[PDB]
């Protein structure tokens, strides 16, 4: 197994590791070894989750610069508008679908938390203008060294536009200086893609361990409200993939049933790794090999959509907010519905392509809309039972995130006439 | 539409923006729209301030490394000693002007502000040696993140000197590596200059918004002895321009009237944007096109003196601390005034080149007169009105700061015989 | 005269610094002047510690990147991986011998300059696995900012390996971008080596000031424990040679006495010239003649060996970290005695060629093990002494470095059957 392992195709490796981890977790729960797997196996899962975070800031700083500097600034404006309007519209529709399914399945209806009416009057703090300001970084190095991906995306796009303006300057000193800066960033982006492709070789172990621990420990609590919220979130993600992307691809002229069988390379790799930004190379190659989108369009829309376009995270937050609110004996309202429609999206735009950041930004959206939790509050008792099925729904959440990443680049490229129609026919 | 506005020559549209903002603020104070302006108009000003602060660490680090690495070791040492003794001399003389002006105006006396002086009487020096040690960055990346300007200036200078020493090695691998590092930093500085060009093209709207909000809210509040502060600060500035610069220019030979005629471009573009590191391009342009100064002088002095040389911040700090100390009813003795001078100089250096930074650094000199910034105390009740007038105070501050940086560059140039004397002839 | 100051050997200069520091401190403490040396003198020796901490993080990141880019599974053949595994293994065992002998001699036991029993008593030590998977950084820029050494050594090694894997790609843009990124990091490492040269030139004054303040405020017996640290390091080096190689050499089937009775020509000149890189010519000469190793592999094992295989420096760090940890008061624990091993080995993988590499690679280990070097704490006072006797430890640790390189060459030659066994008869 010295190289039979490392040579095996990484997709089938992860897809095998997932099922082995599932069966092994169920068996370790059976034989009663929950603590055993929590002590001896989970450290490798945590190592994987920590490996998938050194590949978020370098790969979003050095890939946006190279993507935005490799486009004419006018085409960059046009493509960026066409793709950001799509990201926002689809995240909005995702939250809408999440709220619909959360109302339909009646998520968390019989939780029996003993909390009749905790708190709902603080539903509307969602500072909008302050966030649209916070996109701009008061200090770019602070936004890098603190973990905020949206300010560093803004600064990286600005730097890319500046470099592509420099590379057309009369002097030769500034021309070569800007070319060298762009080459530094190109080298960094490529080195990060290579490190990600190397971490993926360890992924068939660090996802084995993660799902082994999840199955072992929380394989029994998915019976009532938890099974209902899992069913709700996954039916919502299915509804999204079947309605939103399919309508958007049919109204433009892209066979959805073909787009899916083309994206099945990245859908899976994001489904099991649970990191829409650690599966970025597979997306940036499945959007160029199969779908044929030009290197100009995807190389900027995908490194941006990998972090700011999270339809699945929007949907998961929209469903779990309704869950935790029905868990405190007082559902949302119409006003609270639209408050979520905005706050969940303004949180999706922020959360990074990290395994299990949806839970953190979910706690954030709760601390926004009324349900403020203290370390002993009933809202906290309700939200704490979500981090159990965290992974079991994070998988589908990330799958929909990446599928949406792909069906936006395809739309933009089909509009811009940069879609190789020779690839879209059999 | 836009391209018409985008070509209207800036520095002649930003002034129109500022005057429209003054008119709008007065009209809003008339109709009592302070809240409407603060909620609709101010966010553009906040965005402009954040865009200005975004370009303070990268532009300083990059332009300073390039400047220090492009001159010489020895010529850099000489220019550095001359320009540092110049900045210290002018800051000291400016604080002396500030103190004598605050005394001559009887500022903050008839205000009969609270006399709660029971804990803020014991004055203490600023621990000078501790600051001179703080100049050395304990961790250069931590000093880039936390947004400290003097440690990053020190690291940039030492790195530039080291790169110049490297570029002379007999080897070739290390010479080419040094050239590549320096070209990275050159490209970064040039990209930051383009970004500042774009921000300053946006600056009409931002200036309109900021000064409109101010002249709406504080358009009626500056009637009483608070106008004494404006008179004092503006008199100190107007005379330090015509007593310190108009003498230091006649001792060395530069005709000061021609100096003003030539520096107008960088004067009325920093009087309205209130940022020294946001007029660094509109200063490095004038000190190369109209002043006629060698590139290897103003390419280091101006990025250096952008932050450490703040004569108007020093004068403003002196006058304002005198105002507060008179507001609580505690005068300053002649001996204590020297402590105030030294702390105002020390707070001029380590102040950011951003709008409204001296007011934030006003506490650093308020501590050295023994005063304390505890809430509810009269000290805060005067600091509030100071923060109110901060807008116009900072406009004047930055204008005289940039004029001082220009005059210091010109002095170092003429004493180095690099000042191209063919531009100073009628 | 300052040229004579810069011309005296940097290491033998710090020893006179330490000796005059001890003498001047004893005098000023016996004649009632402790305040004088603490207020006037001491800030020199504090600026020195600030200058040492300024250089750790850049010389860790930028040097590890180039180092790991010279040691890569993508440019290491069969002979390469053998010698690199041997180098890392023997450096690990050398740090372990250093820690063992430091525990045996009980170095720095009676220094007593520790403040008390504990400032953050028991420090809540994380589990061993929680500090084994705390090597991978969740954010590489945050680990640069917060000044963590292992989460940036790991990221730098990963980036370097990826960069080597790039420069062998069939493309041209990617290969060129990787070459440019490596040029950037090479230039940064060289600039840091220049700054380290300058700081170590300043180090006599800094060490003199630090030790003078120490001896003035409290008698700490600088002569006793240091006379024990030198003895402990030399016993560790003798043990390192005897055990670590005489075991390995006899395991791989080579007479150890027949190896030592030949390498004596290189050990002596490595002892005297104290520059392993400068001793490389005669090292290759002896490995050619006496060891009978063919040119094909000591043309590669010795050059690489004299720059990444620092067994003597590894043992020096292993012992002086124990000395510092036992001096400032709280002994060193397993969860830390393994971090010391990891950081010592993974920095030897990128050892700088400069007089003063042990000093930096010890400030780094004291920063990574959790004994932060800092301006004033007993860590700086117990680290200045080791920086003092650096010039006594160097003459032996260089001998151990060169003998380790020779033993590695002979071992790798035996495991591949290229021994001129006609040189090993009687
Ligand atoms: N980890 C997901 C986001 C989430 O699940 O919150 C992603 O990579 O986009
Ligand atoms: N506005 C000043 C800063 C300050 O006044 O604090 C400047 O020129 O940067």
Residue numbers in the entry:
A (entry chain B), B (entry chain C), C (entry chain A): 5 to 430
Provide the publication's sentences verbatim.
Structural studies of the archaeal homologs GltPh from Pyrococcus horikoshii and GltTk from Thermococcus kodakarensis have provided the structural basis for understanding of the transport mechanism. Both GltPh and GltTk couple uptake of one aspartate molecule to symport of three sodium ions. Glutamate transporters and their archaeal homologs are homotrimers, in which each protomer consists of a rigid scaffold domain involved in oligomerization and anchoring of the protein in the membrane, and a mobile transport domain that binds the substrate and cations and transports its cargo in an elevator-like motion across the membrane. Here we report cryo-EM structures of the glutamate transporter homolog GltTk in nanodiscs, revealing a variety of asymmetric arrangements of the transport domains.
Using a sub-saturating aspartate concentration, in which we aimed to occupy ~1/3rd of the aspartate binding sites in the nanodisc preparation, we were able to solve two distinct structures, with different asymmetric arrangements of the transporter domains. The individual protomers in the two structures are either in the inward-open state, identical to the state observed in the Na+-only condition, or in the outward-intermediate state, identical to the ones observed under aspartate-saturated conditions. The difference between the two structures is the number of protomers in each state, with either two inward and one intermediate-outward (2 in:1 out), or one inward and two intermediate-outward (1 in:2 out) oriented protomers. Roughly equal amounts of particles were used for the two reconstructions. The frequency of particles found with “2 in:1 out” or “1 in:2 out” arrangement (89% of all particles) indicates that the inward-open and holo outward-intermediate states had the highest probabilities of occurrence under the substrate-unsaturated conditions. Our data indicate that we visualized a part of the multinomial distribution of the transport domains over all different possible states.
